[PDB]
Each structure stands twice: as C-alpha cells, then as structure tokens.
Amino acid sequence: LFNDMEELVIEQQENVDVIDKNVEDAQLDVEQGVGHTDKAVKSAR
Amino acid sequence: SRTAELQAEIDDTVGIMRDNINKVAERGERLTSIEDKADNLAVSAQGFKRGANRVRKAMW
Amino acid sequence: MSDPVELLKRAEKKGVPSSGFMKLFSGSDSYKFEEAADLCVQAAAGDSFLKAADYQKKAGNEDEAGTYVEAYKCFKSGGNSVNAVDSLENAIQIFRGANFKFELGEILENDLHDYAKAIDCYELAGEWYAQSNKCFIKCADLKALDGQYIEASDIYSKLIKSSMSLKDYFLKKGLCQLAATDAVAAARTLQEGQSEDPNFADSRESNFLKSLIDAVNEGDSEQLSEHCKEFDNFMRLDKWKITILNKIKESIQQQEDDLL
Amino acid sequence: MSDPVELLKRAEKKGVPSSGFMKLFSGSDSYKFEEAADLCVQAALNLAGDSFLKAADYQKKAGNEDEAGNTYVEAYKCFKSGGNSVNAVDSLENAIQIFTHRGQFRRGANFKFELGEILENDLHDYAKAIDCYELAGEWYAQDQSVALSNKCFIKCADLKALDGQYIEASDIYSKLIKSSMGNRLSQWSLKDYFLKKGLCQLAATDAVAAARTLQEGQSEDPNFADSRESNFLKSLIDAVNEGDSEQLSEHCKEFDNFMRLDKWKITILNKIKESIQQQEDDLL
Amino acid sequence: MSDPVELLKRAEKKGVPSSGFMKLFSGSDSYKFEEAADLCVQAATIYRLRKELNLAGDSFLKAADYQKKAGNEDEAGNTYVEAYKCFKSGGNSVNAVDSLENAIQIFTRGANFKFELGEILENDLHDYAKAIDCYELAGEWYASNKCFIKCADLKALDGQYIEASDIYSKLIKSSSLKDYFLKKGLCQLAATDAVAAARTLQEGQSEDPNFADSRESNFLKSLIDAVNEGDSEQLSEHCKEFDNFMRLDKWKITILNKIKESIQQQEDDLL
Amino acid sequence: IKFTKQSSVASTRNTLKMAQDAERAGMNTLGMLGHQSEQLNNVEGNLDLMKVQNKVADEKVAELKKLEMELEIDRNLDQIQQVSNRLKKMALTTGKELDSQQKRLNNIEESTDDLDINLHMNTNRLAGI
C-alpha cells in the first residue's frame, strides 16, 4: 500500500507541474490584457 | 501480548492506508480535471490578451 | 443600494427585442440583452441569475450564460433543489459538463431521490471523465440498489479493469452476481480476483465471498447469516451490502417457496 | 441548438481560400479560417473528434498553432474516449509536433507518454511505445524532471526487456540507478532496479555482467546489500553458473513465496530457463 | 529556416532608439523594440532547435532586454525564465542565475524562482551563503517549511547553529516534527548549549507524544547526557547505535563531527 | 523446534525489511505531498490575483462599450514495533493532507472554472468593440 501510494503521488506530480505553469502563464496574460484595456480606455476617452 | 498488540496496530495502519489509497485516487481525479481546466484558463487568458490588444489598436 | 425590483423591471424593459419598423433603424439587439443581463446580475437571486443567463443566451454569449452555475449555487444554498437541477442542466448543456453532471446526480440522489436520473448522470459523468472511477462507483451502487444487478456487476468489472478499492470491487461484483442468483458467475469472479490480484486472494473479502457462494450453493440461509455476522464483527457492513444480502436471503426464501 | 452538420457545412464553405482575382480584393484568409474553426468547434465522440480535427486544421491554416494544438488535444481526448485509438494517436501526434515546434517540450513529453501508453495498451504497438517512452524520458531529463524521466525510462526498459532487447533495457536500468542514487525518495526503486538489470543481463546469458551488477549494488547501496532482491539475484547467478534449471525454479518459488513476482520477471526468467534448455541442446 | 545570425542582426538594427530630429517624426520606440524582441525570439528558437542552448539563452536575454525597453515587463520575465531554462540545460549556471535574478525582480513566482536559484547556487556554484539567502527569502514570501528546511540545513552546515535552531523552532511551530526537534537539539549541541538542547528535548517530549516515544528523542537525550559527562566515546557509541537502526545523513555527520571536535577542544581547555 | 525457530527468525527479518520498505515510501509520499501542496498554494495565489484583475477588466470593458534465535526474534519484533509506530502515524498523517488538499483542489477547480469564463465573457465583449 505504501509503495502504491508513493507511485500514485509521483504520477500526480505531473498534473501539479502543468497546473502551476498554466495558471502562472494565464495570470501574466490576464495582466497584459488588462494593460491593453487600460490603454484602450485612455484612447477612447 | 506484545505480538498481538503489534498485529492489531499493523491491521489498523493497513486500514488507514487503504483509506489513503482511495483518497489519493480522488486526488488524482481532482488533479486531472484541474490540469485540463488550467489549460482552458491559459488559452482563454491568451485570447483575452490578444482581443484587448486588438481593441487597444482599434481605439488608437 | 439600488432596488433589485427596479433593476429587474429596467432589464425587462431593455430585454424586449426590436420589432417591425424599428428593427430597420435599431442596431443589433445583443447590446440590449447584455445591458438587461447586467442589470439582472446587479439586482441578483437565483431567479435573477436565471433571467440574466437567458438574456446572455439571447445575446450569443453562451459562456456567460453558463449565470446558470451561480443560479445552481444559490438555489442549492437556498434549498430549491428543482431550480438548482434546472440551472445545472442548462449549464451542462452550454458547457465541466461531467463535473456538473456529477453534482446534478448527487442532488438527484440525495435531495430529490430521483435514483434513475442520478444513475444516468453518474454514468454520463463517468463516461465523460473517461473521455470516471468515482462516477462509476456511484452508478454501480445506485444500479445495484435499484434492482439492476447485472449492470452493476458490469460496471464493477469495468472498475476492476481500470484499477488493475479493487479488493472491495471484486466482493461487490460477486455480491451483485449473487443477488442475480448467478452463483456460477460469483465463483468465476472470485477465482479471477484470487488469481489476478494477490492482495485480494488473501483478503478477508475473498473468504467472505467464498463463504457466501458456498452458502448459496447449499441453500443454507442461516449459514449465510452467520457468515455475515462474522464479517461484520471484523469489517463493518454498509447499507449497500445490507440490501444486497437481504435480497439474497429473500431469494433463498423464494427458492424455498419454489421448493413447494 | 444549431445543427452540427449545418455548422460543419458553413465552416467548409468559409474554409475555402481566396483564389484568383478575388485574392486581390479579399483580405487575409486567416479570418475565414478562424470563423470556420469556431463553427467546427461549435458543431463538434468520434464525430466531435473529427470536428475538432477540422477546427485544428483550420487553425493551423490561420497561423494559430497553439489553438490548433489545444484542439488536437481535445480531439485526442474524445477519440480515446470513443474507443477510436487510431484517431487519438493521430491527434496526439499533431499536438506533440505543434508543442515541440513551439518549445513546449514539457507538453510534448506528457502527450508522448500518453501516446506510448495508448500504443502499449490499446494498439499493442510495442516498438512505437518504446520510442515514445524513450523520447518522453529524454525530454523530461532535458527539463530536469528526474522523476518523470525515471518513470518514462522504467516503461521503456520494461518494454525493451519484454521485446528481446535485454542489453538496452539493462543500460536504461543503469541510467535509472545513476539518476536515483543518493535520493532517499527512490531507494526501493533502486533495490528493484539492480535486480531487474541483473535479470536482463542474465536473459542475455551474461552472467558475469549480472555478477558485476550485484557486486556494484551491494557495495554502493547498503539497503540493497541486505535486501532479498540481492540474495535472489545472487541465487539466480549461481544457478545459471551451475546450469541447474531446477535450482533456479526453486529459487523463483522461494522468492515468490515472500515477494510476489510480476509478469515482467516471469517472462525474463522463462526466457532464461529456455536458454538453459538451449544450452542443453548445445550440450548435444 | 532563417539564419539566426541574420535575425539577430536585424533585431539589433531595429533595436536602436530614435535620436535627434528623427524622434520628432518617429512614433513610439516600443514597436521597434517589440519587433526586435520577436526577431531575437525567432533566432533563439532556431538555436534551441539546433541544441545550441547557450546561444539561444543569449538571444532570449536580448529579447527580454528589448521587451523591458518596450514596457512589456511580463513578457520580459517569461523570456528571462526561458533564458534560465536553456542556460541551465546548456550547463551555463552563471547565465541561468542572472536570468533567474532578472525574472525574480520583474515578478516581484519570485519565491519559486528564488528557490530554484538557491538550488542552482547550492549544487552548481556552491555559493552557500547566497543559497541560504534565497531559501530564506523564498520561505518568507511563501509564508515555506521546505525552504526553511533547506535554509536551516545550509546554515547549520555553514557554522550558524543558533540561526539554524531558530529556523527549526519556526518549522516546529508551523508544523518532520520528530526530526525537527532532533535537528534543533543537534544544532544547540553544536553550539555547546547543552541546556538549550535539554530544553528542546523536554519541550518536544511534552508537546508531541510521537516525539516522546520516538527514537529521535532517546538519541537526543543520549547525546545530551554524553556531552554533559564529556564522554566522546559514549557519544560515538550512541551514534553507531542510532545509525544501526536509522541511517544517519551527511548533515548529522557534520554536526556530530563538530560536536566531537568541540569535546576535543574542551579537552584542550582542560590543559 | 530448532527448524521452527529458524523459520521464525527469517520471518521476522523479512517483516522488518518490509516495515522499513513501508517507511521510506511513506516518507517520500509526505515529502512530495508537501511540495505539491505548495505548488497548489502558488496556484491559489494566481487565481486570487486573476480574480482582482478580472474585476478591473470587467469595469474597463464596460466603459469601453459605453464609449540466540529467541533473542533475535525479540529484537526484530522490537524494531518492527518501532517502525510500525511510525508507519501508523504516517498513514494517519497522509490522510489528513489528502483531506485538506482535496478541499483546496475543489476550490481551485471552481475558481479556475469561473475565471476561464470571465475571460471568455470579456473576450466576446471586446470582439464587438
């Protein structure tokens, strides 16, 4: 049981890695997008 | 009596570990879904960035 | 704070599509629906989310409509299971579908007791997740409790193949096959589990299943009861197993009726 | 709900590139491909996968490679989901190519491992599965993900040993041993690694190499020195040295009685016993 | 495929800011920097496809600098992260450290990349002080237990026993515990503070039932008694007994070696 | 009697080795779970930041639109008991983290689910401007 648990957590490490990277990338893209909407509002005014 | 106590403790720990295996199966399930949704989130964030940039250029 | 009733009235006023001559001079109605949805969202609460979601659908913003999830959340928090089910259905249709289908099946099983719809939802969620083991566990449990022993055993076989929990799976499967009066199938399942999973071969579940198979073969209901009590003394039984073995004992009684 | 067939027809109509004179007045075709891809996504388990594939092709034609890869991943999801392993494999291949061309070797490796799993279990294409696992492990190593590369290499070595490539499997096991050395987290893996490596070297009739591996494991890893795996490997080496197949069988039964053997070990030792029988044939 | 050298030359040509009279007629220089960064990224991806990881890292660095000049700080940070990745894969630890530093500054992610930077410093460059600083900062921002474990380990190995014991106390309070107590006591015993080690042992025994019956508690008590009696041989015997059942690690080896040398130093003070 | 005692010695030796097997695996599981819990903490922070940024985006988009053998048996049992105590604690311990992370993952899934849509919402609105 301990061995199987260890193996499953090793497998789930992949999911955690990808999730972390994707959420981080998304955050930076959202920040850039907000910057773009800010400049767009500045011009539209 | 010491050996019987040891056996009882080992049986209890086997039960707890069986429970843990079921829980880690549930954790893997929560994680396969969250990885896919974080992918969706990344795609949507990029799309939002690009759309906002296109509107920025339009207003300019 | 603005009056939610006034906001809803304004949204309804703005939510009227352009008709007749005005349509030739009025722009796309999407903006009116968007404004009405925003007003409804401000006023909102589950009913108001539902109205906002409908307006968003009319505006073409289907993802925004999928307001349906918020409606489900607040209806469930408000105790309105039917509206929560409806909102989950629209959100599932718009979309996540499996997650919300599992939630819908949970709502049906616990709040509305619509066991057939819960089984369908769990099967659908499990299929999409496979596209799953938890959903299939729920589906098999409900199906076995619903009189569909063969289908529950098939789902248990699928679970066994996917997981190759197993120690219980085999047992449950055999129990279902024994609820269907198919002792030969139960013996085959026991042998397969013993030969395929070394842990199950030496597990108390394997011995209990073998004892149940022997008891059904000899038609000794009292021996089956004794084995059930022995199994309970070391590993507590659950209501699912209680029901399966109760139906099995009543099947032995029915055989005694056929004996006459 | 809109008819998916009508949506697909509209996407196909919009997906025709501008040709001839019209090209001088029609803007960039990228927007038409984007609209066709959106229509295909809406219309789109096997039919849904085919429609994701069409949307991904249109996205590629539009230059949105990342969206094409995402759509290919969805196509793979549903083809695997529909029991259509071949279309899932194809979708994974396109997604992997897109990701690797964009520098996302992590995604390429993840989907290559999934593709190797599909090949090994669904299509039984063991050579392609070995290639996929090897490549995925290599890319994971390039990302310094030691554990993921180790998993991929475990799969690759297992399949290679089952495939008759004992020397390559032993080399991969040596790589795994070197990567896992000094880590408190992978020690049992090591305990098994050594054993497996030796078994492979014994499947190749190289008893000297198996003995060298046993000595290296004993001297390098104190845990392995006192492990049952070390004793079992030594017993197997001695049995092969004396050419006593029955003694090897007895040792295998003794090892099974305390630690259950797996089909991989079963195959390796079966080939070893048949090699002893072949030596008996050479004995005549 | 386009020549990466030509792409880099074009990026450099486009990367020149407008000066003098031309600035009155040329628009914002941000677009020129963006185009130069894109050209550098293309050349660098070509380098990566060729396994020329160091050149690709240099090209990401140039693209990140151009992005910074363009005001796109997030893109600059991503490019710096890519530079760190390819430099680290290329074996250039110094450039990887630099790229991680720029990415960390831009993000301040900072904690994740600071932990990675501390790992690089500890393993690749052996800059243990900077690794300790990085681990401490990463743990603080995360607040953290892992970073503090790394920081305490390096600090104890670095001669800072009191600070390592303080970090171990923080870890104990936040929470591993069974070992923590032991390690803390060991550090307090490396600092010749046997009273503090005894206090830590008593606190662990009274607070954590698991530690009270744990072998770590007995071993720590034996070490405290041995230091109290000044019997180095008894300490060695206790260490061997502890190793026989629970293998010791290089950290503990170093701590107990310094402790035994401190007993020898006391023997020198005995004269 | 001698043969049986020898068999008991061998049995306890294997039991101790396996108990040690369980212990290392469990310690690795806990280490990895601490690292993965932390990655998920990082995920949680970005989801929070993206929530704030989506609020800003909502308002900007809206405005844009508006604009000897006995002794060994005893000693081996001693050690098996020692390791077993640590194995039990580990099983309990692993369970608590799985519970906590499970609730954290549920919340991460829901928050990620929402943000994804909020981004789609604003993207569709921007398309029309």
Curated annotation (Swiss-Prot), chain A:
Residues 1-40 form the t-SNARE coiled-coil homology domain. It is found in: Membrane. Belongs to the syntaxin family. Present with 450 molecules/cell in log phase SD medium. Required for vesicle fusion with the plasma membrane. This is Protein SSO1. It comes from Saccharomyces cerevisiae (strain ATCC 204508 / S288c) (Baker's yeast).
UniProtKB/Swiss-Prot annotation, chain B:
Residues 2-60 form the v-SNARE coiled-coil homology domain. One of its GO terms (biological process) is vesicle fusion with Golgi apparatus. SNC1 and SNC2 are vesicle-targeting proteins essential for normal secretory traffic between the Golgi and the plasma membrane. They may also be involved in vesicle fusion. One of its GO terms (molecular function) is SNARE binding. Keywords: Coiled coil, Isopeptide bond, Lipoprotein, Membrane, Palmitate, Transmembrane, Transmembrane helix, Ubl conjugation. Palmitoylated by SWF1. There is a cross-link at K37 (Glycyl lysine isopeptide (Lys-Gly) (interchain with G-Cter in ubiquitin)). The lineage of its organism: Eukaryota, Fungi, Dikarya, Ascomycota, Saccharomycotina. It comes from Saccharomyces cerevisiae (strain ATCC 204508 / S288c) (Baker's yeast). Belongs to the synaptobrevin family. It comes from the Eukaryota. This is Synaptobrevin homolog 1. It is found in: Endomembrane system. GO terms for cellular component: cell periphery; cellular bud; cellular bud neck; cytosol; endosome; endosome membrane; Golgi membrane; plasma membrane. Residues 1-60 are cytoplasmic. It is a single-pass type IV membrane protein.
Swiss-Prot record, chain C:
The modification N-acetylserine is found at S2. GO terms for molecular function: ATPase activator activity; soluble NSF attachment protein activity; syntaxin binding. Gene3D superfamilies: Tetratricopeptide repeat domain. There is a cross-link at K229 (Glycyl lysine isopeptide (Lys-Gly) (interchain with G-Cter in ubiquitin)). InterPro entries: NSF_attach, TPR-like_helical_dom_sf. It is a peripheral membrane protein. GO terms for cellular component: cytosol; fungal-type vacuole membrane; SNARE complex. One of its GO terms (biological process) is vesicle fusion with Golgi apparatus. Keywords: Acetylation, ER-Golgi transport, Isopeptide bond, Membrane, Protein transport, Transport, Ubl conjugation. It is found in: Membrane. Belongs to the SNAP family. Binds to vacuolar cis-SNARE complexes composed of the v-SNAREs NYV1, VTI1 and YKT6, and the t-SNAREs VAM3 and VAM7. Interacts with SEC18. SNARE complex protein that binds to cis-SNARE complexes on membranes and is required for vesicular transport between the endoplasmic reticulum and the Golgi apparatus and for homotypic vacuole fusion. During the priming step of membrane fusion, is released from cis-SNARE complexes by SEC18 to establish a pool of unpaired SNAREs, which are required for interactions in trans during docking and fusion steps. Can displace HOPS from SNARE complexes, which may be a prerequisite for trans-SNARE complex disassembly and subsequent rounds of priming, docking and fusion. This is Alpha-soluble NSF attachment protein.
UniProtKB/Swiss-Prot annotation, chain F:
Residues 2-64, 68-129 form the t-SNARE coiled-coil homology domain. Coiled coil: none annotated. Component of a SNARE complex that may be the effector of SEC4 function in exocytosis. Belongs to the SNAP-25 family. Interacts with SRO7 and SRO77. This is Protein transport protein SEC9. It comes from Saccharomyces cerevisiae (strain ATCC 204508 / S288c). The gene is SEC9.
